[PDB]
Amino acid sequence: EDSIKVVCRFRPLNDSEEKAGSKFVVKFPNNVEENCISIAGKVYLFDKVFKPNASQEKVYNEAAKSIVTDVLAGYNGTIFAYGQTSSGKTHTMEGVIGDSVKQGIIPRIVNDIFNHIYAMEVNLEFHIKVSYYEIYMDKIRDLLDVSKVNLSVHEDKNRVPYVKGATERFVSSPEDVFEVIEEGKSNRHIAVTNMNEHSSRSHSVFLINVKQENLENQKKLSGKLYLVDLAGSEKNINKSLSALGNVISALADGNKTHIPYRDSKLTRILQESLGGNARTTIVICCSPASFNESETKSTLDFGRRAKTVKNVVCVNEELTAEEWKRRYEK
Amino acid sequence: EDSIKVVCRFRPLNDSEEKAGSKFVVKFPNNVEENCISIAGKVYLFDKVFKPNASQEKVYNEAAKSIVTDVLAGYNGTIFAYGQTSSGKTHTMEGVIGDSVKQGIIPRIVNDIFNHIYAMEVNLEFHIKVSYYEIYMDKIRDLLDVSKVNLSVHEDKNRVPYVKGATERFVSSPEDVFEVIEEGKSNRHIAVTNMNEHSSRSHSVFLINVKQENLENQKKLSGKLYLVDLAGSEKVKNINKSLSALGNVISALADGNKTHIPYRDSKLTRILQESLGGNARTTIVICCSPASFNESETKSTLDFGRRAKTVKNVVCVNEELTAEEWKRRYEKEK
Ligand SMILES: Nc1ncnc2c1ncn2[C@@H]1O[C@H](COP(=O)(O)OP(=O)(O)O)[C@@H](O)[C@H]1O
Ligand SMILES: Nc1ncnc2c1ncn2[C@@H]1O[C@H](COP(=O)(O)OP(=O)(O)O)[C@@H](O)[C@H]1O
Ligand SMILES: [Mg+2]
Ligand SMILES: [Mg+2]
């Protein structure tokens, strides 16, 4: 009963763009609900629309709303950034780590997780593991350990697609996690000639597995929290992105059956995120430039279609076979 | 619709019975179906009736065999011998272990089982544990290690009951079990003044817990085998608190009142809880002297038989589904 949240961010018109004679051609009819864009005769409504002067913090407050609360209550949650190259996926997911104002969703998330744990009463033992890898040309390289290239996907005991053989690092403070991110960022350069080119055509996948045990209940909860910065969505295209569209499309109205998750590694990893058991926000990012009109329009279409999709979401309680049997009676 | 199976065994007229001037007071009308006795001159019917010269083997095949393939199919099954002292319980359940012809139900079941395990076409990992203990005045003693008299009875996740902290010896071959049996047999002779009296007044129970994993698809199944030699059914007050509980449980199950069943009123009846009305396939073997002098005792053994055969057991395969599988089995309800 849980619509995928879709949130739309326009960046400021930049230089290449004024000086190549691109006009700013986007409007924001309002509202009051502040959730609407007009481009060249089309009109779109989402959960929020952010204007070029919207700050990382403001954006974080909407996009990452309950997610850390949710993940700490044992819900899976995901955020990913979708749109063409240079529209601001990385600015948004990452921004400038270390800069208070200019940092993006991931780092805020990270501080915000630990602050919540501290301020938490009830004595709970947190195991927190993190992974960081990329999908490029439908192949997975672990950024934490570059000998693990071309990794494979497999389903688990619950039949949830996970990436097998990937480094999972324990962490106990923000500084820990940031050290891991900085590790991954240089590893990504290994064998890479043009990083602008490489990262615009690959998916960066950041994963925070959050296990909690209550040291009285004996109650174990769990939450997978995925932060993803996609390959650029431009044209045709980049094939995991057709897969993403095809999965989105197949989820319309109804419909939980015959869904082409396997069409790509990406879409397998994101399986719960789209239709399954997670709360999912998507940030679509857009240029406001006239030159980018059709690319913007499709990003918005994609957005349009994805808004309508509803997830099947519950607490990930960790039970033994015995308990689950009993928990069944009426 | 697994009704408990009742089987009736008469043994030959014995030496002391003759000298004391007792006649054979029992006929076997044929049948054909081989299923009835008439005792001066009231008739009783059972699943099967064995004349004084039935061989061990015949008794085994015609009353036990099917239990071996059941437990291998993951069902619980139990066999017990009931009837007055001297009537042939121990001869039936045990016989003479060494002796290929004179051995009884226990060793043959054990042979049968390993053999079937040997020749299984599909590949399985089979773990077998046996337990071996004695009930005596509602007090459980472990024959595998005498450091434990007085063992508790506990429930479990499903329901059991089962006996806490009894020796469970892992076994791999018949000789493995035969040794364990010889272990409990000499370990019984001690803490005990006369054996015959003690024997006659106690229940001996043998459990074979039979666990299996299908290596190919990891499908898991379990089975318990209770092989019980009861105390003599005679008040000869002088009757047994466990036998009486047995009579009452069966009595309860023979009318319509469930609502309530006296299981708790004895340890014995708690162990045999699934065997009686619960989730196991149960065969009872009533043993009888054919001597005129025993006519009364014989008849109550018969009547107990006649009441037990009408009990219905409520059985299903003991599948051990994993956690994940149960989780969804519960989307059924909610
Ligand atoms: N909302 C924004 N405000 C200011 N500058 C931005 C914004 N979004 C993107 N930029 C700038 O645009 C350039 C490209 O953005 P980037 O996030 O790398 O695009 P993408 O990762 O989607 O290809 C970078 O200089 C970035 O800092
Ligand atoms: N079917 C039978 N055929 C021949 N002898 C038997 C048979 N059943 C019992 N006996 C003999 O009669 C005696 C009583 O056997 P037993 O099983 O000890 O009685 P109980 O019911 O007290 O255990 C033993 O000496 C045994 O060898
Ligand atoms: Mg990029
Ligand atoms: Mg005896």
XYZ file of C-alpha atoms and ligand atoms in Angstrom:
720
model
C 0.000 0.000 0.000
C 3.145 2.103 -0.450
C 3.637 4.246 -3.578
C 7.215 4.761 -4.805
C 8.048 8.402 -4.007
C 9.220 10.433 -6.941
C 10.975 13.685 -6.509
C 12.192 16.016 -9.240
C 15.287 18.224 -9.161
C 16.252 20.896 -11.646
C 19.761 22.291 -11.509
C 20.825 25.835 -12.466
C 21.673 26.548 -16.091
C 25.472 26.375 -16.398
C 28.129 27.852 -18.779
C 28.404 25.470 -21.685
C 24.710 26.264 -21.747
C 24.337 30.107 -21.644
C 27.328 30.448 -23.938
C 26.006 27.843 -26.351
C 22.788 29.915 -26.314
C 20.465 27.637 -24.343
C 17.479 29.353 -22.723
C 15.963 28.395 -19.372
C 12.643 26.793 -20.419
C 11.070 25.236 -17.334
C 8.202 26.573 -15.190
C 6.855 25.774 -11.716
C 3.066 26.405 -11.410
C 2.221 26.568 -7.733
C 1.413 25.699 -4.984
C 1.402 25.465 -2.010
C 1.865 21.800 -2.993
C 5.001 22.801 -4.910
C 5.005 19.573 -6.837
C 4.666 20.525 -10.483
C 6.717 21.292 -13.662
C 5.889 22.552 -17.137
C 8.149 22.020 -20.123
C 7.182 22.743 -23.715
C 3.483 21.872 -23.354
C 3.795 18.864 -21.075
C 2.954 19.033 -17.352
C 3.991 16.799 -14.566
C 3.158 16.231 -10.949
C 5.372 14.453 -8.426
C 5.726 14.339 -4.636
C 8.067 17.341 -4.684
C 9.717 19.530 -7.263
C 12.945 21.328 -6.345
C 13.941 24.470 -8.135
C 17.549 25.351 -9.009
C 18.046 27.141 -5.652
C 16.951 24.248 -3.520
C 19.684 23.229 -1.160
C 21.068 19.846 -0.482
C 19.608 20.061 3.029
C 16.128 20.912 1.887
C 16.388 18.128 -0.715
C 17.604 15.662 1.901
C 14.726 16.516 4.172
C 12.190 15.449 1.557
C 13.963 12.599 -0.201
C 15.421 10.857 2.865
C 12.407 11.527 4.986
C 11.581 8.495 7.114
C 14.267 6.340 5.565
C 16.682 6.255 8.470
C 13.790 5.944 10.919
C 12.404 3.167 8.674
C 15.668 1.327 8.313
C 16.080 1.470 12.097
C 12.589 -0.003 12.484
C 13.675 -2.913 10.256
C 12.353 -1.665 6.819
C 14.406 -1.771 3.608
C 14.663 1.574 1.940
C 16.166 2.831 -1.223
C 17.126 6.004 -2.943
C 18.434 6.381 -6.421
C 19.165 9.130 -8.797
C 18.038 8.947 -12.390
C 18.652 11.250 -15.374
C 21.081 12.094 -18.154
C 24.753 12.900 -17.788
C 25.518 16.216 -16.128
C 21.998 16.716 -14.795
C 23.277 16.259 -11.236
C 22.978 12.672 -10.109
C 26.350 12.752 -8.393
C 25.879 16.245 -6.990
C 22.694 14.942 -5.450
C 23.678 11.512 -4.114
C 27.149 12.503 -3.072
C 27.803 16.232 -3.423
C 30.887 17.348 -1.513
C 31.626 15.036 1.377
C 33.289 17.070 4.100
C 31.392 20.230 3.138
C 28.556 20.896 5.543
C 26.312 22.710 3.153
C 27.398 21.225 -0.201
C 27.224 17.555 0.785
C 24.518 15.309 -0.702
C 22.233 12.546 0.336
C 24.668 9.745 1.135
C 26.782 11.563 3.744
C 23.720 13.108 5.398
C 22.180 9.721 5.572
C 25.388 8.488 7.176
C 25.603 11.046 9.941
C 21.858 10.798 10.436
C 21.971 7.040 10.977
C 24.463 7.281 13.848
C 22.847 10.243 15.540
C 19.627 8.263 15.666
C 21.289 5.247 17.219
C 22.874 7.313 19.970
C 19.650 9.110 20.830
C 17.909 5.770 20.911
C 16.875 4.300 24.220
C 16.481 0.550 24.637
C 19.756 -1.286 24.601
C 20.231 -2.705 21.066
C 23.368 -4.264 19.537
C 23.879 -2.956 15.982
C 25.866 -4.870 13.422
C 26.245 -2.526 10.406
C 27.912 -3.790 7.249
C 28.462 -1.812 4.073
C 29.192 -2.593 0.484
C 30.180 -0.470 -2.407
C 30.369 -1.679 -5.961
C 29.661 -0.660 -9.538
C 27.702 -2.092 -12.428
C 29.298 -1.305 -15.800
C 28.276 -3.056 -19.064
C 26.101 -5.359 -16.972
C 29.093 -6.608 -15.001
C 29.823 -6.064 -11.348
C 33.152 -4.947 -9.903
C 33.558 -4.680 -6.141
C 35.030 -1.285 -5.280
C 36.201 -2.561 -1.917
C 38.293 -5.370 -3.473
C 39.127 -5.124 -7.119
C 40.126 -8.755 -7.572
C 36.403 -9.513 -7.240
C 35.417 -8.321 -10.719
C 32.463 -9.735 -12.727
C 30.537 -10.777 -9.615
C 27.277 -12.676 -9.869
C 23.778 -12.235 -8.481
C 21.950 -15.084 -6.623
C 18.753 -15.345 -4.581
C 18.842 -16.112 -0.830
C 16.744 -18.093 1.651
C 13.949 -15.523 1.261
C 14.605 -15.372 -2.479
C 15.862 -11.790 -2.372
C 18.491 -10.999 -4.991
C 21.808 -10.128 -3.412
C 25.362 -9.837 -4.811
C 27.423 -12.898 -3.707
C 31.095 -12.574 -2.857
C 31.045 -8.809 -2.293
C 33.100 -7.182 0.435
C 30.964 -6.403 3.433
C 32.849 -4.067 5.835
C 31.718 -3.543 9.430
C 31.602 0.057 10.579
C 30.835 1.729 13.910
C 31.023 5.468 13.213
C 30.573 7.880 10.369
C 34.380 8.248 10.045
C 34.462 4.493 9.358
C 31.975 4.689 6.500
C 33.619 7.727 4.968
C 36.925 5.904 4.967
C 35.168 3.128 3.008
C 33.669 5.539 0.476
C 37.082 7.133 -0.069
C 38.593 3.669 -0.527
C 35.970 2.770 -3.171
C 36.353 6.075 -4.982
C 39.997 5.450 -5.807
C 39.508 1.803 -6.542
C 36.966 2.827 -9.197
C 39.861 4.557 -11.053
C 41.893 1.349 -11.409
C 42.154 0.599 -15.136
C 39.979 3.564 -15.964
C 41.207 5.940 -18.712
C 38.447 8.610 -18.613
C 36.555 8.746 -15.314
C 34.014 11.276 -16.565
C 33.242 8.779 -19.297
C 33.412 5.742 -17.128
C 31.217 6.939 -14.256
C 28.601 8.405 -16.591
C 28.121 4.956 -18.085
C 28.213 2.912 -14.873
C 26.099 2.477 -11.757
C 27.593 3.214 -8.396
C 25.946 1.087 -5.704
C 26.174 1.884 -2.036
C 24.737 -0.471 0.439
C 24.249 -0.208 4.155
C 23.005 -3.357 5.811
C 21.733 -2.591 9.262
C 21.248 -5.457 11.681
C 19.902 -4.946 15.145
C 19.511 -7.423 17.963
C 17.475 -6.484 21.025
C 19.523 -7.769 23.965
C 16.257 -8.612 25.870
C 13.585 -9.510 23.330
C 16.116 -11.701 21.509
C 14.333 -9.960 18.607
C 16.431 -9.515 15.480
C 15.508 -6.908 12.889
C 17.184 -6.056 9.628
C 17.110 -3.349 6.982
C 18.821 -3.036 3.631
C 19.388 0.592 2.661
C 20.469 1.214 -0.938
C 21.829 4.423 -2.338
C 22.394 4.288 -6.072
C 23.751 6.766 -8.633
C 22.795 5.398 -12.045
C 24.562 5.520 -15.308
C 23.336 8.443 -17.375
C 19.899 7.919 -18.879
C 20.599 9.548 -22.283
C 20.247 8.133 -25.862
C 18.859 3.423 -27.978
C 20.592 4.157 -24.605
C 22.408 2.093 -21.995
C 20.983 -1.239 -21.562
C 20.363 -1.663 -17.829
C 18.272 1.464 -18.179
C 15.900 -0.118 -20.720
C 15.665 -2.953 -18.231
C 14.677 -0.446 -15.563
C 12.022 1.034 -17.873
C 10.766 -2.400 -18.872
C 10.485 -3.446 -15.223
C 8.768 -0.192 -14.352
C 6.379 -0.600 -17.250
C 5.544 -4.171 -16.372
C 4.431 -3.024 -12.883
C 1.667 -0.710 -14.097
C -1.825 -1.023 -12.580
C -1.909 -4.634 -11.254
C 0.558 -6.359 -11.512
C 3.085 -8.548 -9.784
C 3.605 -11.257 -12.383
C 5.886 -11.713 -15.390
C 8.240 -8.887 -14.382
C 11.561 -8.794 -16.318
C 13.895 -8.343 -13.303
C 16.379 -10.736 -14.860
C 16.797 -8.574 -17.920
C 19.740 -7.012 -16.068
C 21.925 -7.415 -13.054
C 20.852 -3.877 -11.985
C 17.209 -4.671 -11.994
C 17.737 -7.875 -10.120
C 19.574 -5.999 -7.324
C 16.798 -3.403 -7.274
C 14.047 -6.031 -7.320
C 12.669 -5.286 -3.886
C 13.094 -1.582 -4.574
C 10.650 -1.737 -7.465
C 7.509 -3.634 -6.627
C 8.819 -5.626 -3.690
C 9.598 -5.033 -0.067
C 11.219 -1.587 0.414
C 10.275 2.093 0.496
C 11.761 3.649 -2.546
C 12.386 7.218 -3.520
C 13.656 8.184 -6.908
C 15.245 11.495 -7.606
C 15.046 12.341 -11.244
C 17.498 15.095 -12.204
C 17.027 17.462 -15.059
C 18.773 20.285 -16.900
C 16.591 23.355 -17.370
C 18.272 24.053 -20.756
C 16.306 24.129 -24.043
C 18.995 22.054 -25.820
C 18.168 19.196 -23.407
C 14.407 19.250 -23.942
C 13.803 15.714 -25.203
C 16.168 14.181 -22.635
C 14.447 16.144 -19.957
C 11.045 15.055 -21.280
C 11.960 11.391 -21.149
C 13.420 11.669 -17.709
C 10.108 13.126 -16.718
C 8.186 10.371 -18.548
C 10.222 7.822 -16.702
C 9.405 9.674 -13.534
C 5.730 9.767 -14.512
C 5.515 6.008 -14.993
C 7.479 5.205 -11.812
C 5.316 7.346 -9.516
C 2.339 5.056 -10.028
C 4.071 1.985 -8.636
C 3.233 0.565 -5.224
C 5.388 -1.569 -2.941
C 4.542 -4.484 -0.607
C 6.309 -3.407 2.513
C 6.838 -4.931 5.933
C 9.229 -5.316 8.835
C 12.095 -7.741 8.279
C 11.834 -9.799 11.457
C 14.423 -12.505 11.957
C 12.685 -15.652 13.261
C 13.761 -19.265 13.723
C 11.885 -22.048 11.898
C 10.137 -23.023 15.143
C 8.714 -19.581 15.940
C 7.540 -18.989 12.387
C 5.541 -22.235 12.643
C 3.736 -21.072 15.765
C 3.375 -17.496 14.497
C 1.094 -19.178 11.907
C -1.938 -20.407 13.984
C -5.567 -19.210 14.094
C -8.150 -42.671 9.143
C -5.352 -44.786 10.736
C -7.189 -46.769 13.379
C -4.798 -48.339 15.880
C -4.139 -51.973 14.810
C -4.692 -54.676 17.403
C -3.087 -58.085 17.127
C -3.653 -61.060 19.365
C -1.009 -63.679 20.205
C -1.606 -66.901 22.107
C 1.356 -68.931 23.198
C 1.411 -72.697 23.956
C 0.110 -74.164 27.186
C 3.103 -74.137 29.517
C 4.620 -76.680 31.889
C 3.426 -75.282 35.226
C -0.027 -74.561 33.751
C -0.437 -78.300 32.926
C 0.778 -79.656 36.262
C -1.708 -77.316 37.958
C -4.474 -78.875 35.816
C -5.395 -76.182 33.294
C -6.933 -76.991 29.904
C -6.568 -75.123 26.615
C -9.726 -73.052 26.709
C -9.518 -71.268 23.424
C -10.542 -71.884 19.854
C -9.575 -70.311 16.570
C -12.501 -70.387 14.209
C -11.377 -70.235 10.563
C -11.155 -67.678 8.873
C -9.462 -67.528 6.317
C -9.226 -63.846 7.362
C -7.345 -65.385 10.323
C -8.809 -62.822 12.670
C -10.750 -64.320 15.548
C -10.668 -66.189 18.897
C -13.411 -67.664 20.837
C -12.945 -68.017 24.489
C -15.396 -70.251 26.201
C -17.254 -69.501 24.007
C -17.426 -65.740 23.374
C -15.803 -64.509 20.155
C -13.466 -61.628 19.592
C -12.175 -60.217 16.360
C -8.934 -58.434 15.708
C -6.775 -57.308 12.829
C -4.919 -60.616 13.169
C -4.768 -63.584 15.541
C -1.716 -65.794 15.955
C -2.088 -69.393 17.049
C 0.358 -70.936 19.608
C 2.729 -72.083 16.870
C 3.024 -68.930 14.854
C 6.713 -68.259 14.249
C 8.410 -65.010 15.237
C 8.848 -64.286 11.607
C 5.166 -64.715 10.820
C 4.222 -62.398 13.706
C 6.781 -59.862 12.509
C 5.670 -59.818 8.915
C 2.031 -59.882 9.583
C 2.101 -57.101 12.177
C 5.300 -55.041 12.087
C 6.966 -54.937 8.652
C 4.865 -51.989 7.342
C 6.133 -49.865 10.206
C 9.673 -49.949 8.854
C 8.672 -48.477 5.579
C 6.433 -45.935 7.390
C 9.220 -44.455 9.537
C 11.413 -44.263 6.449
C 8.591 -42.345 4.918
C 8.721 -39.944 7.909
C 5.730 -41.101 9.998
C 5.835 -42.016 13.677
C 5.001 -45.563 14.529
C 4.841 -47.569 17.670
C 4.456 -51.106 18.725
C 3.623 -52.291 22.171
C 3.073 -55.615 23.882
C 0.323 -55.753 26.521
C -0.969 -58.562 28.698
C -0.414 -60.531 31.849
C 2.963 -61.593 33.230
C 4.157 -64.840 31.607
C 1.965 -64.313 28.590
C 4.785 -63.639 26.089
C 5.337 -59.887 25.781
C 9.088 -60.044 26.099
C 9.335 -63.090 23.911
C 7.358 -61.214 21.293
C 9.113 -57.845 21.372
C 12.606 -59.150 22.001
C 12.827 -62.915 21.696
C 16.449 -64.133 21.494
C 18.643 -61.496 19.747
C 21.389 -63.798 18.399
C 18.925 -66.296 16.961
C 17.836 -65.741 13.403
C 14.609 -67.657 13.989
C 13.841 -66.958 17.623
C 14.546 -63.237 17.516
C 11.541 -61.027 17.878
C 10.178 -57.805 16.722
C 12.892 -55.494 17.961
C 15.917 -57.007 16.335
C 14.051 -57.681 13.116
C 12.771 -54.179 12.842
C 16.386 -53.141 13.310
C 17.600 -55.452 10.556
C 14.792 -54.479 8.330
C 15.526 -50.817 8.755
C 19.223 -50.741 8.006
C 18.710 -53.007 5.051
C 16.138 -50.632 3.640
C 18.518 -47.782 4.273
C 21.349 -49.663 2.585
C 19.420 -50.244 -0.593
C 17.824 -46.803 -0.922
C 18.077 -45.619 -4.586
C 17.943 -41.881 -3.889
C 20.907 -40.641 -1.834
C 20.137 -39.612 1.767
C 21.994 -38.685 4.904
C 20.410 -40.712 7.703
C 21.139 -40.023 11.346
C 19.770 -42.621 13.810
C 19.681 -42.181 17.584
C 18.263 -44.723 19.956
C 17.161 -44.193 23.517
C 16.566 -46.940 26.087
C 14.789 -46.536 29.456
C 12.461 -47.976 32.094
C 9.353 -46.716 33.848
C 8.728 -48.042 37.392
C 6.200 -46.530 39.781
C 5.799 -43.459 37.522
C 9.583 -42.934 37.770
C 11.844 -43.020 34.628
C 15.279 -44.717 34.799
C 17.847 -44.615 31.889
C 19.352 -48.008 31.119
C 22.110 -46.491 29.104
C 23.661 -44.727 32.149
C 22.524 -45.486 35.714
C 23.821 -42.139 37.007
C 20.382 -40.982 35.927
C 17.331 -42.361 37.676
C 14.256 -40.075 37.791
C 14.027 -38.306 34.442
C 11.565 -35.569 33.711
C 8.978 -35.454 30.935
C 8.673 -32.188 28.993
C 6.650 -30.795 26.071
C 8.269 -29.138 23.001
C 7.659 -26.551 20.245
C 5.074 -28.760 18.439
C 3.706 -30.823 21.374
C 5.835 -33.934 22.082
C 5.933 -35.083 25.183
C 9.485 -36.414 25.316
C 12.010 -37.418 28.025
C 14.519 -34.708 29.004
C 18.174 -35.610 29.140
C 17.946 -39.313 28.345
C 20.948 -40.814 26.555
C 20.616 -40.639 22.777
C 23.284 -42.903 21.290
C 24.073 -42.383 17.558
C 23.990 -45.647 15.610
C 25.136 -46.921 12.215
C 24.549 -50.632 11.897
C 22.445 -53.321 13.599
C 25.328 -54.575 15.709
C 25.591 -50.963 16.870
C 22.089 -51.248 18.253
C 22.401 -54.790 19.482
C 25.289 -53.680 21.729
C 23.229 -50.805 23.059
C 20.485 -53.299 23.803
C 22.904 -55.582 25.641
C 24.044 -52.473 27.537
C 20.584 -51.619 28.940
C 19.905 -55.299 29.644
C 22.724 -55.837 32.162
C 22.317 -52.262 33.435
C 18.764 -53.181 34.402
C 19.706 -56.024 36.757
C 20.999 -53.523 39.296
C 19.348 -51.355 41.977
C 16.877 -54.252 41.792
C 16.068 -57.000 44.291
C 14.247 -59.601 42.142
C 14.281 -59.162 38.391
C 11.273 -61.234 37.417
C 9.086 -59.187 39.789
C 10.816 -56.014 38.736
C 10.509 -56.867 35.037
C 6.859 -57.810 35.490
C 6.147 -54.548 37.236
C 7.974 -52.125 34.935
C 7.693 -50.866 31.396
C 10.731 -51.052 29.095
C 10.734 -48.631 26.199
C 13.048 -48.393 23.284
C 13.168 -45.402 21.050
C 14.700 -45.200 17.661
C 14.768 -41.689 16.365
C 15.142 -41.778 12.628
C 16.196 -38.545 10.928
C 16.809 -38.087 7.223
C 18.067 -35.467 4.817
C 17.587 -35.729 1.074
C 21.013 -34.603 -0.210
C 19.580 -33.827 -3.676
C 16.793 -31.375 -2.672
C 17.452 -31.064 1.112
C 13.855 -32.110 1.913
C 13.859 -33.202 5.560
C 11.893 -35.906 7.420
C 11.867 -37.447 10.919
C 10.369 -40.519 12.613
C 10.153 -41.932 16.114
C 9.880 -45.596 16.795
C 8.680 -46.642 20.182
C 9.044 -50.328 20.889
C 7.447 -50.952 24.248
C 7.294 -53.921 26.554
C 4.699 -53.006 29.200
C 4.367 -54.269 32.755
C 1.940 -57.182 33.244
C -1.657 -55.971 32.964
C -2.809 -57.895 36.078
C -4.144 -56.505 39.360
C -2.222 -59.469 40.805
C -5.691 -53.921 45.181
C -2.579 -54.848 43.090
C -2.943 -53.029 39.673
C -0.556 -50.446 38.070
C -1.008 -46.625 38.108
C 0.272 -46.522 34.527
C -1.816 -49.393 33.335
C -4.832 -47.802 34.879
C -4.012 -44.529 33.148
C -3.664 -46.560 29.966
C -7.122 -48.043 30.450
C -8.607 -44.631 31.043
C -7.000 -42.980 28.086
C -8.186 -45.748 25.783
C -11.609 -45.605 27.466
C -11.802 -41.871 26.884
C -10.804 -42.348 23.229
C -13.393 -45.142 22.745
C -16.481 -42.972 23.578
C -17.104 -39.380 22.446
C -15.459 -36.982 25.009
C -12.148 -35.200 24.198
C -12.955 -33.279 26.628
C -10.979 -34.849 28.260
C -8.103 -37.313 27.825
C -6.238 -38.366 31.038
C -2.770 -38.245 29.406
C -1.108 -36.342 32.256
C -2.208 -38.839 34.922
C 0.907 -40.908 34.293
C 4.266 -40.497 32.601
C 3.805 -43.593 30.429
C 0.603 -42.178 28.989
C 2.362 -38.927 28.327
C 5.111 -40.606 26.345
C 2.540 -42.589 24.411
C 0.416 -39.505 23.893
C 0.868 -39.434 20.087
C 0.756 -43.187 19.957
C -2.739 -43.094 21.443
C -5.080 -40.876 19.453
C -2.153 -38.722 18.331
C 0.185 -38.614 15.384
C 1.655 -42.118 14.963
C 0.610 -45.469 13.421
C 0.132 -47.782 16.311
C 0.063 -51.477 16.609
C -0.731 -53.181 19.875
C 0.045 -56.783 20.454
C -2.021 -58.371 23.161
C -0.469 -61.520 24.542
C -2.467 -64.356 26.068
C -2.056 -67.519 28.014
C -4.428 -70.156 26.721
C -4.889 -71.759 30.174
C -8.384 -72.169 31.643
C -7.037 -70.970 34.934
C -6.274 -67.581 33.334
C -9.651 -67.127 31.691
C -10.537 -63.875 33.515
C -7.246 -62.164 33.062
C -7.288 -63.302 29.495
C -10.722 -61.767 28.954
C -9.765 -58.360 30.266
C -6.745 -58.455 27.980
C -9.127 -59.252 25.202
C -11.558 -56.439 26.172
C -8.727 -53.950 26.365
C -7.780 -55.109 22.851
C -11.358 -54.666 21.671
C -11.443 -51.170 23.034
C -8.088 -50.103 21.631
C -8.837 -51.227 18.090
C -11.533 -48.563 17.768
C -9.247 -45.651 18.418
C -8.514 -43.353 15.467
C -5.047 -41.849 15.054
C -4.461 -38.447 13.460
C -1.307 -38.763 11.434
C 0.666 -36.970 8.758
C 4.283 -37.000 7.494
C 6.676 -35.334 9.929
C 8.212 -32.867 7.489
C 10.772 -30.460 8.915
C 10.213 -27.326 6.832
C 12.825 -24.565 7.179
C 12.158 -21.077 8.557
C 11.601 -19.405 5.205
C 9.080 -22.019 4.168
C 7.018 -21.603 7.341
C 7.064 -17.788 6.979
C 4.985 -18.030 3.802
C 2.888 -20.954 5.108
C 1.592 -18.161 7.354
C 0.603 -15.794 4.552
C -2.014 -18.508 4.198
C -3.782 -17.187 7.315
C -2.859 -13.467 7.325
N 21.651 21.568 -8.140
C 22.890 21.985 -8.528
N 23.416 23.165 -8.114
C 24.625 23.616 -8.495
N 25.430 22.942 -9.337
C 25.055 21.718 -9.821
C 23.735 21.158 -9.426
N 23.613 19.969 -10.052
C 24.745 19.767 -10.770
N 25.601 20.798 -10.636
C 26.938 20.861 -11.248
O 26.851 20.249 -12.531
C 28.029 19.508 -12.849
C 27.538 18.130 -13.288
O 26.723 17.538 -12.280
P 26.795 15.981 -11.871
O 26.105 15.838 -10.526
O 28.230 15.500 -11.963
O 25.927 15.307 -13.048
P 25.722 13.720 -13.251
O 26.398 13.041 -12.080
O 24.240 13.526 -13.227
O 26.335 13.430 -14.590
C 28.874 19.555 -11.584
O 29.710 20.707 -11.607
C 27.872 19.897 -10.501
O 28.471 20.348 -9.265
N 4.620 -67.765 21.376
C 5.388 -68.449 22.252
N 5.819 -69.680 21.908
C 6.585 -70.396 22.746
N 6.998 -69.969 23.943
C 6.647 -68.755 24.416
C 5.796 -67.898 23.575
N 5.617 -66.771 24.284
C 6.273 -66.886 25.465
N 6.903 -68.073 25.547
C 7.716 -68.592 26.679
O 6.888 -68.486 27.831
C 7.550 -67.735 28.859
C 6.938 -66.345 29.078
O 7.545 -65.405 28.196
P 7.605 -63.835 28.512
O 7.670 -63.055 27.213
O 8.769 -63.650 29.445
O 6.291 -63.430 29.330
P 6.053 -61.865 29.640
O 4.773 -61.452 28.979
O 5.947 -61.950 31.142
O 7.235 -61.050 29.151
C 9.011 -67.648 28.466
O 9.636 -68.781 29.069
C 8.993 -67.799 26.956
O 10.207 -68.433 26.518
Mg 27.826 11.282 -13.847
Mg 8.356 -59.639 31.131
